[model samples]
Target: LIPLIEAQTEEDLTPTMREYFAQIREYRKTPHVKGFGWFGNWTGKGNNAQNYLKMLPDSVDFVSLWGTRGYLSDEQKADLKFFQEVKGGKALLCWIIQDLGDQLTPKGLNATQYWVEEKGQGNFIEGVKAYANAICDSIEKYNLDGFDIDYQPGYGHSGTLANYQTISPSGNNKMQVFIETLSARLRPAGRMLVMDGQPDLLSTETSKLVDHYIYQAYWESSTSSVIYKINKPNLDDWERKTIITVEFEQGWKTGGITYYTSVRPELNSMEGNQILDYATLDLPSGKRIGGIGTYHMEYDYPNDPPYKWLRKALYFGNQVYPGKFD
Candidate 1:
């Protein structure tokens, strides 16, 4: 087991990374880490993409690319190509499933309202189907490994739509159907379907349809457990066969960003115990932990700073394996 650590800077892939990968690979092969800027609203500027790829170890299994609304344009395609050319592995293309202004929906599909219902009259199915088709087209067009559904279902202060607390039954149903449909379509094409949502949003049924169900454990706070709050209802009865990941910690605001004692220090230790705990406890799922998120990069770490702790978390946690792992 290993944690899916996100490589945030060129320093992460330095020459010494070869040594790091050599040691880490022995514990868990094909770590499922992603490069930054794939999300983070980056518009492909300067040497960011090139430098980030250069920082990766040649053995990296997969690179995660963000397919945000305005962010996944032709220019982003070019930048992605740069990563694919150098990655020496597969690429994971994840997109935001939000109803931003361009589509002219009730409220923009911000994290707040992504999976919830809109107040006005709008064809949610049509919008989602279009999104799925467009994303599928992008994958085929760019030759990507798969899709990640980054759905944040809620609205903010100035949201046009109000009452986010109410979960529309239709909206939830549509989301489930969307996952099943998307999985059916993409699975045959040999692409992965991952949903980076909380545990409640992901169910055993949903997990069965997609390739991996990555529960964003960042919201779990200091729970010290991978069990997502949302999945409580189906936890006891479900057969639980999905690939689970517990992504921990966001970036700290430093010159760029550096590891702290927070979750960084305890990730490996926590994950290591969780792996055994899950196994011994007959937990019919796998676990992986991830490090600081997007925007955490854009800075630099010391020559030999605290990142090794992150890699160790990935190693012992056993979340290092990628989608291609057999």
Candidate 2:
């Protein structure tokens, strides 16, 4: 098994082959939560798409070109091609399932209309089908590895939080059906499907269908056993499929800037030693942590000094092999 999997390139890995290799033996000491960064609204300039791709380390398992709003600009597409064909590994174009003004949804298919009024007006299923098909089409059009779904509470609105929570039977059932349909269409073709949400938002059936679950373990003061503590219950069940994400950029928050400099030491500790400790534990189910990931790629700009620290942490973590985190 070891000889068969050694020195294998990303191009040699199909979805089935990737899964098979994962079960053979653990790759890194703690599985290293391979860095999966998101690039958002970046055109070609200083810290643009090209620079972003060049700055990324080989440890990056997935690079998500996020907020494409279902279509990639020509410049973005070119950058994406370079990242996939030249650099290798997976490049996913992210499409938010929730409405973000005129960004993701088409003219009339906005989440506000679909969830608040149109569903009440009997347009729920049709709207969801159309939206799902559009997302699938975008993935195929870009020739991407797959797509990521970003659905959060109050996703399309500011004041109304309950509007976007998928906890209700109506909301959860529709989301499950949408995910299953999308998975059915993509998985057979070897395309990956990733979703960002807490464990409760996703049902076990939906969890099983997703290739990776990007757990939003963001904005905390702690670094020790962070991923394990946030996802202890779910970790035993979905460790291999989970990627605990930390925030670097404040796009999701006010001001749209990064705090990498402030958190540089903690980031180093988290990626360097803290997570390794958690990986040593013998869980009742014998599962290990999947890997670590960051929220936005733009924060790690080529010109930023803090970006160097981020890069070093990722490079160091990636170099850690089986039983070598010590």
Candidate 3:
């Protein structure tokens, strides 16, 4: 039997921990569907167990690194290695095209590139390639799986346009070009190319370029709402490749909204009913969703059973929920 060792800090990863993590990696390879998510505020700076990336549920297959300070702390680097190498989970750098009133053309999807006076100055296509490479460079430097493109048109912030526009300026869909360029480098290298929030922004030709498509359908009075979001004309194979996610960030509760309670009326939050129901649910096409995830999943750490909801989602997805392991 593989020994189960509890490691709180990166410093605790001795050979014993290494052995445990090795076993964990093997267990992850067992047959099961994938679970994906964004892990917000991923600093990995402190020694606190709660703040450590290792504290994440073992069943969580992929994590998007959200809200970083641009520089990698030593602990952050170590945490990345631990998850990818030991736990066999993937980590991705997120590039957000924010709701910043496009006071001007935000050249590329990398939000910071918008501020660089020289970014899309001349040839927009070349400028975007330069941007994609620089961001993919970070992927290699940090040993990330790839990148998660957060294209939040509606929920990103205030004053966001709700529908498709031809382009910011003349050329074409800057987003489509950006995603296509990103897939060019990442595809052959076998890296993740993902998109979330307003996947409808992408055309059918552009939407299939991504390895996974996601929708931030947090508020759902009925499953039909989710279907409507996924049923867009441009999106292809929405049933098998689209990841429908739930919002778990603290802001939902504080913002005078009832997205959480309204999401799962029957089951309490700890049960992860939203995810379980969705994970077990199939689309009208009768195909299972590509995955289920939550934003700000760290917020669930305080649940009584500690990550119970996520674990439950995985077990249910694996057809072993509330039952003995085979």
Candidate 4:
């Protein structure tokens, strides 16, 4: 066996065969995150729940169901169970705290109101804790693997008019407490606590507490990109715990408008370059790419072969292969 293994050589392989082997080697060597933000309500359309479940690769590590508010419909609950128990995937409920219409907004809160109006005033610490507990309860009810927080301020009209600072000394302290409390409840149960927000919004202490930080490097954003310039320094410190996200589908568009769409030629080019650079770059500091997060399924091209092909290509190194652990 040893002699036969040693006898194999690159010269013995055809050009196409050699390329296939090379791709396999790269795929095996690279360790990264492949995450998806699934919208719960879109489960009944053509590209519905079953389609996403079938399209997701067995190697996928993380999936968060967006729009987690209200009662868990029979179909939605079943879908979560299938992803977790059947596919062995980590399914989390996504909570967007600032956006009122977001699926995971706490019940009884008007979508037109602001975060400050709900709980950012009076005893701030207690107010935030109450909000966090509400989220935790929802996660428990669904028996999900974990919960992901999409924390962005000034999302609605009322929120925009109100002057709320999430990174200020007091605001930051409240956030840390909220995270610590949630982590304490979720971690012991073997559940994850992921966050999607700007790097600077979280303190060093807070950053270390969460499971993964899905940085919103959406659009043509990168570490050096203008949108990320302020947070890049802080992001560098938390690379191992961060998964840089980029949008392939356009989230904002009207029926007749075509400008700045998701399918722009530049988006494909940018995504390809970023994936290549991250996968092949050499770092002496031992910092490497943690993972890549795609915005969502709704925005993905309708006619594409599979969902998020660009992400799948980079994640699997242009090859469809088995999981390393399996």
Candidate 5:
């Protein structure tokens, strides 16, 4: 309910910062429900609240940054230190370029060979390894908990890499290989690997690789949107790893379009954060959903006392530690 601490050099938490942060840790640890979201335009400037990772809602279970820079600044590093250690949440690096792997092709090798050995001129699976390792190397170097592959190529995203969701014309399953390769390394290391944007759009075998399948339920099309994602044929892990998110800035303004929970028949629609009923509902599978979230959740920070809706969502989800909100 107070202004959060932004990243600063030579930072030391004031007693008040300590108390709030400790409460944040307590809130985070007690939650059976997890929270996931993305916030960015991070420039390591320490100038704007969104630019600093610490500005994120304290109870978030996972965060993926969208910085203009590929490298971390000192301020960014300090926040990661606290966010990971102090808050006990995972901070992740994001890749939005759908075919991010193609760009990682070996020097002197063209896309085909580098991607699939189309002419037997490239290393085939090894090229996929090279791409995955490059992604892997960056996470460790930056001290992030893991990475997110945001495959939204249709949204005016440009790239030459294989569609991470399906096969490419070259007979290459680059996306699957990339996931398998990274999951091999990061999963065993306790690092999280997330896939956002139509989470279940992956090959059935490949679907098992992601730690969480974040549905970008930004706008909706009746119930058709939410129902199909978790019920993807051959993919039944939705109860264990799926997360549904709304577009935060727009979501709050409109209450909710259609997000994690379909509006119940009794109510024509949900009014704002009430969409989080999914967190408390007795689902058909007997297992509740993995979690609930809103992208750009920090946008709600300006509400009365700030983070009001998020706290409420977490409270409903039991993702918030009891008494903190009271």
Candidate 6:
């Protein structure tokens, strides 16, 4: 395969760049590809959008469509036009439900509110069902490929599994069933399913339903040696799985694809970029690295954008893992 290239110059990405991108395409023709970049809000204030896509030579296979809730009315359709239809780039739409009603709280608290009362439970179920249905409806309406459900049972500023205590096993059962049903409905339609940050669910009866499980192994204050631990539960079923590009660089003003790296927005040096780069390539299991996934990318950076780092990861990463990580 020819070397992969990205046209940094504004000369309309010459045929040479396209040729290099074609080589990367050839590399991804098989299975287990390395998909990189951010998940949402690709449109910045101005021409930056064009500038960013310019760095990518159509080699990007998949990206998260940011988290749910934030998607605009025409976000999905616009993405379909720009990526899937235009460049043949596949995308993962963010379907957020777990953090529906709860307001943002202090760090380490749950990002969502849980329904404990019998009557209140209906809201939660309906909320998830509505969002899921909307997403599925959009998929059908626009013929979208698939989605990434960011259902963090116990995370964000104010969300957790403990909320399930007041609810019945039936609730959890229903949620699981919802996933199973969603997968069944989507897969036949030529769409892929991805779950965010939930490994425990992989053990439950729900594991058999989805297509891929993306372990958001970035947060949790331990990035040094949990790779294998993260992969341990999912390894047994490696044939149908992909790992996340855990440590990402998220800053307040940074306008890139994966924007979750900003929880530590204070430090604006290359340290965040370096850490992210290292994490993307090094996996403890070493089981032929699958892909890299990230979160949010619509904020403003202090001085410059960090999309170049993503290009570096993707261009170099495809060399390590040939095809789709999933």
Candidate 2 similarity to native, TM-score: 0.65
Better of 1 and 2 by lDDT: 2
State how far residue 92 of model 3 sits from its true place (Å). 1.3
- Per-prediction TM-score: 0.52, 0.65, 0.75, 0.64, 0.75, 0.61
Per-residue alpha-carbon lDDT of candidate 4 for residues 1-326, written as tens digits (9 for 90 to 100): 22212213445556675575566445433555444455434352233433344235544566777655546665556545545543455778775555323443446765434344455554556556656676778788878788887766644422321224444345655556667778888899988888776445665556666777676555442324522333344432555556655454453121111222222234434435443333322233445545555566445435344444444445543233222210
Q: Report the Cα lDDT for residue 168, model 2.
A: 33
Number of backbone collisions per candidate: 21, 2, 0, 2, 1, 25
Itemize residue pairs with steric clashes in candidate 2.
Answer: 33-291, 33-292
* lDDT comparison, 2 vs 4, better candidate: 2
What are the lDDT scores of the predictions, listed in order? 0.41, 0.53, 0.63, 0.51, 0.63, 0.47
The residue-level lDDT of candidate 4 at 261 comes to 28
The RMSD of every model to the true structure, in order and in angstroms, is 9.4, 8.5, 6.1, 10.9, 5.5, 8.8
The better candidate by lDDT, 5 or 6, is 5
Winning model by TM-score:
5
lDDT-better candidate, 3 vs 6: 3
Whole-model lDDT, model 6: 0.47
Q: Judged by lDDT relative to the true structure, which candidate is superior, 2 or 6? A: 2
Question: What is the C-alpha RMSD, rounded to one decimal, of candidate 5?
Answer: 5.5
Could you give candidate 1's per-residue lDDT for residues 248-274 as a string of tens digits?
A: 223322211122112334333442332
Name the better of 4 and 5 by TM-score.
5
Identify the superior model by lDDT, candidate 1 or candidate 4.
4
